[PDB]
Amino acid sequence: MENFQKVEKIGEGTYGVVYKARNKLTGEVVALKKIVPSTAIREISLLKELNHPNIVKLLDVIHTENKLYLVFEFLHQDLKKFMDASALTGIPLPLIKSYLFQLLQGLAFCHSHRVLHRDLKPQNLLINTEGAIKLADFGLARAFGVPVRTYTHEVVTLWYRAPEILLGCKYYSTAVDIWSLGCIFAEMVTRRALFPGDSEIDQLFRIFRTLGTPDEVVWPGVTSMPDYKPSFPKWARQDFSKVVPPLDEDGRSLLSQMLHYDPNKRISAKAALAHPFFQDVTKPVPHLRL
Ligand SMILES: O=C(Nc1ccccc1)c1cc[nH]n1
Structure with a gap:
């Protein structure tokens, strides 16, 4: 994803690698998860609005090239x-x-x-x-x-x-x-x-x-x-x-x-x-x- 610079692999989730990454323009440090069913994409998009101080914020859903990336707020x-x-x-x-x-x-x-x-x-x-x-x-x-x-x-x-x-x-x-x-x-x-x-x-x-x-x-x-x-x-x-x-x-x-x-x-x-x-x-x- 051209808008992100991968800092380190933080882990391996159930779905794919988890990267610490920086947003090449906003300067934001995020968690980037690499993970296409029409259903899945509508489901994830509803998750964008399910916001609470105790739920890791989903910043962004990026579907490109049959690739799916979820951008989350980073916790250490x-x-x-x-x-x-x-x-x-x-x-x-x-x-x-x-x-x-x-x-x-x-x-x-x-x-x-x-x-x-x-x-x-x-x-x-x-x-x-x-x-x-x-x-x-x-x-x-x-x-x-x-x-x-x-x-x-x-x-x-x-x-x-x-x-x-x-x-x-x-x-x-x-x-x-x-x-x-x-x-x-x-x-x-x-x-x-x-x-x-x-x-x-x-x-x-x-x-x-x-x-x-x-x-x-x-x-x-x-x-x-x-x-x-x-x-x-x-x-x-x-x-x-x-x-x-x-x-x-x-x-x-x-x-x-x-x-x-x-x-x-x-x-x-x-x-x-x-x-x-x-x-x-x-x-x-x-x-x-x-
Ligand atoms: O996985 C995330 N952060 C993390 C976890 C363990 C050690 C260091 C960083 C993460 C996922 C979403 N936000 N942060």
Whole structure:
């Protein structure tokens, strides 16, 4: 793209290379994602107007030469790197709370407009020096699908996938985002992925081992889902006090609502923002090492 100067490769997304680039005329530093279906282009174009302080701004969609480039506002780190970096001591709780709180506001805005993310994970949550956190790649899964592998063959993580997706639900809802963020919330607290599955069945059985194998009691309709098997093992549900120590009762309360099996009972982003866990929410500045 003649209007951009590629500064460095920052990464490899599910769809293609991600470049840090500068706009040869505006002087703007952006993130440039290289990714043609008529449908995809209309979908992405609606994303241009879905603007919120906690959603990485899509600056521009450039379709040229059967090539597709998305131009995003640039943020200097993602949450996965920040968590790696905060391994020894953990992300402090007030900062975990502010991030979750901001992320929920993000989801509440998108969701109210009926946009799902569908592939939330720490690599697409981006952070700046001001204490902000923002969701990247919102709405791209609807436009482009979610591949078992990326363009580089790197395996798409299953770790944050809602169970109604793993059980083959075709028509899942906004609740699938709530589930992922719940998994991400647990991970920040404990410094270990909640459910790090390495196949769909491992992913599901890991969920079952912690949350209880789901039945008709906790999840009406579950036994009628496409990939449900009466032969699944029947595991007992563990207490959250064991799962996310040393998270407090309000935290554990909210986490459990975000991880309800039935997507209809799963707490919405909007209700979550009202939960007492956020009574004392503040906005700390992290220390970043740019
Ligand atoms: O990927 C982006 N930025 C980034 C991520 C990790 C490390 C350094 C920079 C990005 C995507 C959209 N804006 N920024």
